[PDB]
Structure 1
Amino acid sequence: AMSESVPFLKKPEALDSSMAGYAGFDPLGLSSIADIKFLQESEIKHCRIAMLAAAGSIAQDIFTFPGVSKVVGTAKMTGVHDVLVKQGAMGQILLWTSFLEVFGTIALLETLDGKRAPGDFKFDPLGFSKNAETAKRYQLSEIKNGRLAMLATGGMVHGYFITGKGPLELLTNF
C-alpha cells in the first residue's frame, strides 16, 4: 500500500481510488486535517474558476467585445480589474457569483451531510454524461484540466506581473 505518485510514501488513508483524479498524492497529510469531501468540493470549485480564468486570459488576448476598447485602453490582464471596479463590471460579476454561492453554500452543507457528491450540481443540459461511460472519463478529464488550469492561471498572471505582456503577447514577443 504505497502511494502511486510518490513511490516511497505510504498510500494516503483518507484518499481512495474511487475518487476522480486520484493519484495517491497527499504527502503532507492534509486529507486528515480537513474533511476529504470539503477538500474535494474546494478543489473542484478552484478547478472551474481557474479554467474560466485561463480561457479568459487567452480569449482577452485573442479578441475583445464591442466597445470594451473604449473603456479599457492599455490595461491587459489585471489592470482591467482595476479600471472596471470603477465601471460596474466587477461589482456585477461579484454580485451574481455571490448569488450563486448562496445556493452553493446550501449544497456544500448538503454534501457534508452526505446527500450530494462534491462539485455535483446536476448541470448537464446537453446530456454529455447521459451514457455514463463518458461520465467517468469526463469526471477524470475535468479534474485534470482543472489542475492544469490552476497552474496555468498562476503562471500567466505571474508572467504578466513580470513582463506586462499577457500570455499570447508574452509568447509572440519573446
Structure 2
Amino acid sequence: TINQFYGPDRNKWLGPYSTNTPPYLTGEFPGDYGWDTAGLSADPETFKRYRELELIHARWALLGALGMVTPELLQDDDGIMFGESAIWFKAGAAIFQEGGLNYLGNPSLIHAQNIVATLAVQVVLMGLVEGYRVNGGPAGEGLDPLYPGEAFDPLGLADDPEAFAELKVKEIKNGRLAMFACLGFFVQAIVTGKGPIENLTDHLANPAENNAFAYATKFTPQ
C-alpha cells in the first residue's frame, strides 16, 4: 500500500533498524528513507533543490546505464558492425575512424565526420532546452519544475494519485539503481579497462579467482 513507503512507519534505509529518523524527512516526497547521515539536507529549500537535481541525475543515469551495453549487446562474433568501438568507454572514437560515425554498422545511419559541428549543435539545442526546463516555453511554463506532465505524458498513465506515489518511488529506486550501476561502470572502466559484458562472462566462467581482488595489485605504487 501507500503507507508502506510514505507513512511515518515507512520503508527505511535499514528496515526496522532506523530508529533515529531525521525529523524533517517525514515521507511526503518520493523516497524519503531517511539516509541523511551527513545531514546535508537540513535546510528545506536546499533539500528541494537537491531532490530536483536528484531526479534529473536519476533519469539521465537511466539513459546512460541502459545505453551502456546495447551496442555491446548487438556486437557480433567478429565485429563487422563495430570494431573496437563497440565498448562503452571507446564509443567516442567512433568519430575518428576512416569511415565516420555509423549508428549500427552502416553508412546509411548518422554517418558524420564533424565532431566539432555536432558538438555545436548539441550545445546550442540542449542548452536551449535547459533554458526551457528552467523557465518554460512551448511545453509549459508555470508547471512543477520537477513533475510537469503535460506534453511529455501522452499515453495516459499519469492520472491516479496512488499510482503517482507507487510509480514515483519506482522512479527513484530505478534511478538510484542505474545511478549505482553507473558508478560500477566508471570504476570497472578504471580498474580493469574491460567492457561490462565481457567482464561478466569472464566472472561467470570462473568466479573463484576472477574478482576485483585480482586487480587489487594494479594500483600498487611500486
Unaligned runs of 5+ in 2: 1-7, 97-112, 137-141, 204-222
Deviations, residues 106-141 of structure 1 (Å, cap 9, x unaligned): 26xxxxxxx654521312111112233322211110
Task: Give the distance between the partners of 1:168 and 1:134, measured in 2 at CA.
Answer: 35
Find the aligned partners of 2:182 and 2:49 in 1 and give their Cα distance: 23
- Give the equivalent residue in structure 2 for 1:78: 89
Distance 1:138-1:168 versus aligned 2 partners, 3 A rule: same
Identity level (%)? 28
More helix by proportion, 1 or 2? 1
151, 165, 170: which one aligns with 2:180: 151
2:47 to 30, 36, 51: 36
Partner of 1:97: 126
2:70 paired with 1:59: yes
Structure 1 CA distance, aligned partners of 2:50 and 2:195?
31
In structure 2, the residue matched to 1:17 is 27
- 2:13 aligned with 1:5: yes
Q: Once structures 1 and 2 are overlaid, which stretch shifts more, 149-158 or 4-13?
A: 4-13
Equivalences for 1:119-134 in 2 at 5 Å? 119-122=146-149, 123-134=152-163
Whether the 8 Å CA contact 1:14–1:36 is kept in 2: the answer is no
For normalisation by structure 2, the TM-score amounts to: 0.61
The TM-score, its normalising length taken from structure 1, stands at 0.76
Distance 2:145 2:184 in 1: 27
How many residue pairs were aligned?
162
Shifted more, 92-101 versus 32-41: the winner is: 92-101
Q: Is the contact between residue 84 and residue 90 of structure 1 (CA under 8 Å) also seen in structure 2?
A: no
Give, in whole Å, the separation in 2 of the partners of 1:81 and 1:9. 48
Displacement of 1:104 after TM fit? 1.8
C-alpha contact 2:65 2:178 (8 A) present in aligned 1: yes
Work out the CA distance in 2 between the residues paired with 1:121 and 1:102: 15
1:11 deviates by: 2.4
